From Swiss-Prot, chains A, E:
It comes from Ectopseudomonas mendocina. InterPro entries: Ferritin-like_SF (IPR009078), Phenol_Hydrox (IPR003430), RNR-like (IPR012348). Gene3D superfamilies: Ribonucleotide Reductase, subunit A. Pathway: Xenobiotic degradation; toluene degradation. Inhibited by Zn(2+) and Cu(2+). It is an enzyme of class 1 (oxidoreductase). Fe cation 2 binds at residues 133, 196, 230, 233. The lineage of its organism: Bacteria, Pseudomonadati, Pseudomonadota, Gammaproteobacteria, Pseudomonadales. Its EC number is 1.14.13.236. Disulfide bonds: none annotated. GO terms for molecular function: metal ion binding; toluene 4-monooxygenase activity. The keyword Iron applies. This is Toluene-4-monooxygenase system, hydroxylase component subunit alpha.
Swiss-Prot record, chains B, F:
One of its GO terms (biological process) is toluene catabolic process. The gene is tmoE. Keywords: Aromatic hydrocarbons catabolism, Monooxygenase, NAD, Oxidoreductase. The alkene monooxygenase multicomponent enzyme system is composed of an electron transfer component and a monooxygenase component interacting with the effector protein TmoD. The electron transfer component is composed of a ferredoxin reductase (TmoF) and a ferredoxin (TmoC), and the monooxygenase component is formed by a heterohexamer (dimer of heterotrimers) of two alpha subunits (TmoA), two beta subunits (TmoE) and two gamma subunits (TmoB). Its EC number is 1.14.13.236. Belongs to the TmoE/XamoE family. Disruption phenotype: Cells lacking this gene show a complete loss of toluene-4-monooxygenase activity. Gene3D superfamilies: Ribonucleotide Reductase, subunit A. InterPro entries: Ferritin-like_SF, MP_mOase_hydro, Phenol_Hydrox, RNR-like. The lineage of its organism: Bacteria, Pseudomonadati, Pseudomonadota, Gammaproteobacteria, Pseudomonadales. This is Toluene-4-monooxygenase system, hydroxylase component subunit beta.
Swiss-Prot record, chains C, G:
Inhibited by Zn(2+) and Cu(2+). Transmembrane segments: none annotated. It catalyses: toluene + NADH + O2 + H(+) = 4-methylphenol + NAD(+) + H2O. This is Toluene-4-monooxygenase system, hydroxylase component subunit gamma.
From Swiss-Prot, chains D, H:
This is Toluene-4-monooxygenase system, effector component. The gene is tmoD. The alkene monooxygenase multicomponent enzyme system is composed of an electron transfer component and a monooxygenase component interacting with the effector protein TmoD. The electron transfer component is composed of a ferredoxin reductase (TmoF) and a ferredoxin (TmoC), and the monooxygenase component is formed by a heterohexamer (dimer of heterotrimers) of two alpha subunits (TmoA), two beta subunits (TmoE) and two gamma subunits (TmoB). SUPFAM superfamilies: Monooxygenase (hydroxylase) regulatory protein. Belongs to the TmoD/XamoD family. Effector component of the toluene-4-monooxygenase multicomponent enzyme system which catalyzes the O2- and NADH-dependent hydroxylation of toluene to form p-cresol. Required for optimal efficiency and specificity of the holoenzyme. Pathway: Xenobiotic degradation; toluene degradation. Gene3D superfamilies: Monooxygenase component MmoB/DmpM. InterPro entries: MOase_MmoB_DmpM (IPR003454), mOase_MmoB_DmpM_sf (IPR036889).
Length: 491, 304, 83, 102, 491, 304, 83, 102
């Protein structure tokens, strides 16, 4: 006979002891552990609500991968690369580039907890977390690898994080701030309550809906399998948060979660926003970006945070306005500066698409539509010099993404600036400035790509010099219009 | 900008003469944090974690110009690890099932339950320390191929912890008056036979240089556990009519040998740099006395 | 000599790096910014282009130079049309 | 806003099941194991969002019956891509629930 | 350590012994064993060239099914049922109906060998054969079962073999003659060298090519996985055939293989022929039926039989002419009598299709095209009474399929009749008559469905009475034009 | 013809109150050869195989009006059988690997290799006879749910045969002068301890009525093998320091118990018809003496 | 009374069961067969329809009855046009 | 006929590999392990027909190299949907071959 997990589980996490040959603070230094002075014994009440154990883990994960790889093998010849819309192919290129090696970095956030958390159940769940993120990094390298032979842009599934390309710096600044650059308990509440139960659901399930509509079942099946692991290891957050609140650290926990949500928001507005509302073919848009935000981030995620005892973030109303506006401008920035991307952005502004945009975002045509009108008329008249840039956008010193606002008939743009230690910084929101001021030692001597350009680090100091600095190795690798401007024929 | 055609694999692998393997494709050259010496992470260069990495990874006395070229001799990836370990772990769980059907635990020699309570069930603390320690070497190591071996070793440490938890509980059902599942923390903290091991691990867990952590854990502590804990327990189990524990330990020893294999391959890679021989030997000599003392104290408890 | 500013042009969607010259007039600054915006993402229009500190109420005089203005390199300006 | 307030002030809990063989069995199980609750289903093709107000239980026994093959509770993680609510999970069932009423 | 299969394999088949308590002929009666008087010791040289062993079998087959079922689960929502052409859906309905419960019957042909073959390696390979055919029957019931709720015609995946529907009788007469109705050594050479290495490749790999073109990867992936098992257990044939030839039974072996190939040909001409050249959408026809026949049956299968020592069958030239002609008439019969089928036949005669038919079969339009001209003009003029039959086709007493010939400008039709024991039989070829005369006790008192109709067994003796006799349980179940005649708009 | 809507499952299952299971969907009511009493198969009604089936299936004295309603108590399908047996067989193959690493066979009691050569390695003939016999009950049984249990039992018989082949070869590597892998046919044919079993199986293999075949095989022969061959071998192995054979036989006994479970369920189903009690008991009494003699002769060889 | 034959009509693709009458003339037999073929799968044409034993050379006289002909029930006939 | 005679009078042998991850590795293995032979490939999407004249060998070692993961010979049956020629298969290789020359 076998004995049921409930009867031996407590022994698997009965692993705290009172150190004697080194001190408690030597074994769990605050800078790596983040215990905020809470004594060891208090962490023993930590109770992960989504458990697993070693024999079940290896059996269950063996099955998850057998399915994911079988589906991929059975569909190699479904012609996705060949029959897919190029906007869809660009969605794959930007996802794998922005995510694969960041997943592998996430192994280190889980490892930080496995070694430095004072809660024994957190150290074990984070051990499975390490394994899960290894899975995620390896799957999201293996899957795009077959397309290296089709298109050098797929090299960026591996290369992006090794580059200084601007969107890669935005991803790394986010990942390194929330996952690899902080103590264990900060990872436990920041990573789980920004990406893992929040925006991961946009990029791995909202996008899976669009992938299924687009007939790309290898990808939909992959990313939804990945999210099944997330939904287990993210449940390390709740008990950590509860323990902080119980031990008088509510203020600190709220601030960390508020900071992480906003940081994740800005990165996924540039990644996921243009994918959902422009690159994905119109017929395949299951919901708009805003509708998916209201389902996943407002309806599910934020409601869960309130249930666990946090308040709505202070910037709630700013955030709601941003969901209506920000990604439309980020899309326009990525498209106009497409040569700086490793994917080929789709403009997404044929008349039928603009009708959908107007339905999903009333007022769109009198705002962003004004800019696209200029662009469209230039393409129709073959004034292509006017559809490519000759300078750089100004970039946020927090999110590392261009400073934008609402264009057109009720133009409104605001940069939130800050002098600090003799330097002038610029941010794209009140919140981004607020994040900096919470922890300047984390950020203060970081230089964004435009800071580097102005400081002589990018030679020659030209657009072409910046592209070379960004790590492009051939003309083919730089972004172009997904459809080679064939869309203007519909205009 | 020149024009270049598509490559059959990643640009960093495209000069290989061989076709890249699954292992090469998914494991190699993934730590971007080693690219910029003054900024491991994409933050202020003097952020706390950047300072940690510059001190305890970049500044380690163990040095190599191409740590990324290290190769796990077993070439394991997540997929093939879970295939391998589902096989081995299914086998162990089937042993547990059948030996329980046969009432194995009832037939052990008189008093063996007390030896297990004193000498076996507190191993869950030792094995968790190996788990914590392996996770530290993972997060600090200067190449993703090294860190991957460490992730899998962290998981194996938890495998061993979980075996020990399961068997401690199971043994307590036949022998409810031996403190099984009840006193292990106090033994780990206060029993002399455990104090050498506890001192060894508390000090090893505070060795933060990546190279020192690796050598102390994998070249000194873990081979000692094989020679002085696993094998002597098998021998004592034989003398005491416990036929399950030797089979369980043989499965754990397959994992332990695998940890030794990758470790030795890392030492071989390291030694391409002549300066590393002195650095590794120095750390081996520093940690060996604490490991020898730990072994002696444990063995005197086991035979008492 | 080279003087970098960050500029937001009326009705555009972003702030851009524009390198102007220390002795450029505000008129010349406005034209250098417009080059990167008008007929690219902003419809041309009649009227006089004016320069101000970002979100400021006060306009710089048209013939004022960037040296005379008190602006510092990398400060944010708006280029807007006289109301 | 009104739209956002309404979206946030919900008490919906339950599993998000990825496309595959567990979708219909979980919907059926949710109905059977929560007979006093209206079960709502939103089908997004790649996943299905299944919810009830306040609490939604899935028992292993019912799910095994509806799936039609031997089933352990832990296996649901192969297809549980996300969930609304807090979770409590054991060998016999999974409970999705909220502590607060919003 | 483990010892390699080569070193212990011989012991797994060292299982012949000399009986003492019953006689050799009692233990292996000729009527069940088919040893043709060849003594036990001679069968010990039987050496299966595609081996497996129990531990490898269960591991390898666990993997095969995990893939097949994962693919099915991942694609439930690809809309095949919903977005597929109805000709394709009809292809699924006729395949599962004609095959699933016949696969389960094949377990009994393998069991016949497992118990009654004198060759020890054949008894073990046939044990894996039993398991493989169980797999095949269970997969091809489980896969169509989800579509029961869409369309009562999918009930016939289970029901067909329990009916007296005419195509089901054709399938059962073939299966029962070649697989369940003969001694072990007859199964060993008839089943392996007609269906398993022959026509199975048409229905399970040629059709998989068309399924993949049609985007039905659940089905393509399923049927090609099934054929991997066939390609192993069919290799029980070669050593049996070799042993017969060595022991002076060449004549008998050649006759059995010649008979089985022709029987399989007629059944797969009615199943597979209309699927490949008419039901499958034109854009999805990877090759024509004849091209696939020349690849699989002539180029691969028949060449293998020559290599193993047999001659081309005597009817070679008749067969080659049949490949150009027969299925065009069988298609026309199935379509005109569609109400007697459990699937909805597609006519497949739009102008673009007729151009392809003319390219693939020069002369088609002056032959079958003449008949389709009449039919097409009746549909266009809404004379629908003229597009449904009011009598039954005459049916072959061997294949159980309508008696056909070449219509139109060089009309040629021949029925080969035979008086035997006071009864008049009719056959659709010289070969079918020849098959009957080889073994009349196998066939002589069988009555085909028209024999039954004329003998009073079908009441009332009308078309509607015959349909009820055929086991239709509702109006929805009877075949109709796949496209509801929408194709005539292209005419 | 009336109009009818689609059904949620097969028409024959659509009245079930429960949702049909995988087992129901893929296993039930598949033998179309029982539909037409005068023509099992779609051939001349007096074709040789039609006459065989009318004599040895349709005319069996064991009778039931709904054999198809029989249910395997384990509800196994091909998919779940291979999952179950890959687990068990992986476990056995891992035992073989580890016990070989430990040189188990070298440590058996003096002479045990001769007992294995005489009493164990010729079991490959016995187990193959069970394989042949189970395949016969498969092809004759009057319901697909019965035949499916038989297919899986045929495969288990070959599993046991293959274990025996593997171990016979392996033992011969340590003990090359005991006739292992060389004389088993002669022992099966001419050694007295095997002749009871050989007579039993040669006669059982010529019992062609489906009901008699089932009862003789599964209610008489196979329970005898459990009580008089498997269990006594485990006991002898214990006395002779063979610790592998008892574990191997425990895995084979799980299969044997499963065969008993479905058999007993078929007897229960059969006994709904009161006339079947006498028919089953009559066959049990007919075959029991031959089975008792086989057991006694084997046991006298094993203990000699 | 009912007399079943199997009939092959010129230019059709198959043989069909056609039930004729014992006292039908060959003309009447031809018309009963034609009903199931002409304007269904065979183009109508001018000419005289004749009946023969399958693949025979000799035609039955038009006014000959099926009873007079010596045909047996279920024999195969062709219906063809006078050449 | 001429077309049929030519089709029958071939000496092509080799594997038919079903769509999946073994297609390219088997093509490559066929080329490497039969360096004196022209390897032909016919791609029918759901399967690929790979052939050489008279004999075509696939060694386990080469296939493992080309597949890029640990591989046993028996596993090829997961993807070997058919083959031309006679077969001889062992733990080290599979040989497709003909005895006769047609
Ligand atoms: Cl472009
Ligand atoms: Cl119709
Ligand atoms: Fe992840
Ligand atoms: Fe994660
Ligand atoms: Fe089959
Ligand atoms: Fe078969």
């Amino acid at each position: 006979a076998m004995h049921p997990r409930k009867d031996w589980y407590e022994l698997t996490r009965a692993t705290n002891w009172t150190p004697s040959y080194v001190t408690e603070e030597q074994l769990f230094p605050e800078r790596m552990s983040g215990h905020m002075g809470i004594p060891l014994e208090k962490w023993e009440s930590y109770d992960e609500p989504y458990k697993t154990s070693y024999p079940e883990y290896v059996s269950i994960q063996r099955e998850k991968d057998a399915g994911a790889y079988s589906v991929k093998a059975a569909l190699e010849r479904a012609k996705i690369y060949e029959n897919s819309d190029p906007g869809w192919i660009s969605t794959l290129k930007s996802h794998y580039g922005a995510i694969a090696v960041g997943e592998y970095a996430a192994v280190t956030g889980e490892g930080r907890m496995a070694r430095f958390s004072k809660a024994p159940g957190n150290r074990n769940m984070a051990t499975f977390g390490m394994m899960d993120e290894l899975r995620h990094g390896q799957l999201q390298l293996f899957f795009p690898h077959e397309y290296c032979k089709k298109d050098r842009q797929f090299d960026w599934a591996w290369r992006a994080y090794h580059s200084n390309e601007w969107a890669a710096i935005a991803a790394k600044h986010f990942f390194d701030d929330i996952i690899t650059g902080r103590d264990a308990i900060s990872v436990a509440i920041m990573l789980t309550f920004s990406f893992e139960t929040g925006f991961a659901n946009m990029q791995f399930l909202g996008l899976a809906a669009d992938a299924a509509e687009a007939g790309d079942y290898t990808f939909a099946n992959l990313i939804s399998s990945i999210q099944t692991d997330e939904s287990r290891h993210a449940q390390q957050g709740g008990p950590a948060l509860q323990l902080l609140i119980e031990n008088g650290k509510r203020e600190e926990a709220q601030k960390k979660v508020d900071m992480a949500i906003w940081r994740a928001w800005r990165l996924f507005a540039v990644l996921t926003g243009p994918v959902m509302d422009y690159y994905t073919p119109l017929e395949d848009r299951s919901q708009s970006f805003k509708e998916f935000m209201y389902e996943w981030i407002i309806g599910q995620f934020e409601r869960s945070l309130i249930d666990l005892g946090l308040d709505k973030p202070w910037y709630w109303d700013l955030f709601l306005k941003d969901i209506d506006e920000l990604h439309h401008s980020y899309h326009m920035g990525v498209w106009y500066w497409r040569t700086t991307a490793w994917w080929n952005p789709a403009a997404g502004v044929t008349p039928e698409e603009r009708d959908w945009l107007e339905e999903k975002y009333p007022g769109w045509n009198k705002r962003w539509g004004r800019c696209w009108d200029v662009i469209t008329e230039n393409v129709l008249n073959d004034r292509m010099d006017l559809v490519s840039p000759e300078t750089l956008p100004s970039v946020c010193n927090m999110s590392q993404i261009p400073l934008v606002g609402v264009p057109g008939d009720d133009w409104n743009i605001e940069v939130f600036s800050l002098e600090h230690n003799g330097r002038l910084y610029h941010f794209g929101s009140e919140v981004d400035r607020w994040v900096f001021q919470q922890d300047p030692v984390q950020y203060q001597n970081h230089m964004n790509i435009v800071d580097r350009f102005l400081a002589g680090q990018i030679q020659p100091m030209t657009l072409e010099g910046a592209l070379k600095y960004m790590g492009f190795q051939s003309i083919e690798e730089m972004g172009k219009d997904a459809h080679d401007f064939a869309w203007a024929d519909k205009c | 900008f020149e024009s270049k055609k598509p490559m059959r694999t990643w640009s960093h692998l495209a000069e290989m003469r061989k076709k890249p393997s699954e292992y090469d494709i998914v494991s190699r050259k993934l730590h971007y944090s080693t690219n910029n010496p003054d900024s491991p992470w994409e933050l202020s260069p003097d952020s706390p974690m950047n300072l940690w990495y510059k001190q305890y990874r970049n500044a380690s006395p163990l040095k190599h110009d191409n740590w990324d070229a290290f190769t796990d001799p077993d070439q394991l990836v997540y997929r093939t690890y879970n295939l391998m370990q589902d096989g081995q772990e299914s086998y162990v769980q089937s042993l547990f099932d059948q030996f329980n059907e046969r009432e194995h635990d009832q037939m052990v020699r008189e008093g063996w339950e007390h030896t297990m309570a004193r000498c076996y069930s507190p191993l869950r603390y030792l094995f968790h320390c190996l788990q914590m320690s392996s996770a530290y070497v993972q997060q600090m190591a200067p190449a993703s191929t090294i860190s991957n071996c460490c992730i899998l070793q962290t998981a194996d440490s938890l495998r061993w912890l979980t075996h020990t938890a399961y068997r401690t509980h199971e043994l307590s059902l036949t022998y409810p008056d031996a403190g099984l599942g009840e006193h292990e923390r106090e033994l780990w903290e206060k029993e002399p036979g455990w104090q050498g091991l506890r001192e060894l691990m508390e000090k090893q867990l505070t060795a933060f240089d990546w190279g020192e952590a690796f050598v102390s854990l994998n070249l000194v502590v873990k081979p000692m556990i094989v020679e002085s804990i696993f094998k002597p327990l098998q021998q004592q189990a034989w003398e005491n009519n416990d036929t399950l524990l030797p089979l369980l330990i043989d499965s754990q020893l397959k994992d332990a040998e695998r940890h030794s294999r990758w470790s030795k391959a890392l030492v071989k890679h390291a030694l391409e740099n002549p300066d590393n021989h002195a650095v590794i030997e120095g750390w081996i000599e520093k940690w060996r006395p604490l490991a020898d003392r730990a072994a002696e104290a444990y063995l005197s408890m086991l035979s008492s | 000599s080279a003087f970098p500013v960050h500029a937001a042009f009326e009705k555009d969607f972003l702030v851009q790096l524009v390198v102007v010259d220390l002795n450029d007039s505000m008129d010349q600054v406005a034209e250098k910014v417009a080059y990167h915006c008008v007929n690219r993402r902003v419809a041309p229009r009649e009227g006089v282009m004016r320069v101000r500190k970002h979100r400021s109420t006060e306009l710089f005089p048209r013939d004022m130079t960037i040296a005379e203005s008190g602006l510092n390199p990398t400060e944010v300006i708006d280029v807007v049309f006289e109301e | 806003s009104t739209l956002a307030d309404q979206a946030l002030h919900n008490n919906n809990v339950g599993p998000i099941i990825r496309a595959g063989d567990l979708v219909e069995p979980v919907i059926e199980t949710a109905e059977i194991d929560n007979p006093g609750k209206e079960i709502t289903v939103e089908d997004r093709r790649a996943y299905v969002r299944i919810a009830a107000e306040g609490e939604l239980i899935l028992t292993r026994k019912t799910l095994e019956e509806q799936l039609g093959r031997p089933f352990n509770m832990q296996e649901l993680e192969i297809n549980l891509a996300s969930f609304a609510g807090q979770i409590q999970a054991d060998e016999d069932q999974i409970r999705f629930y909220f502590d607060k009423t919003m």
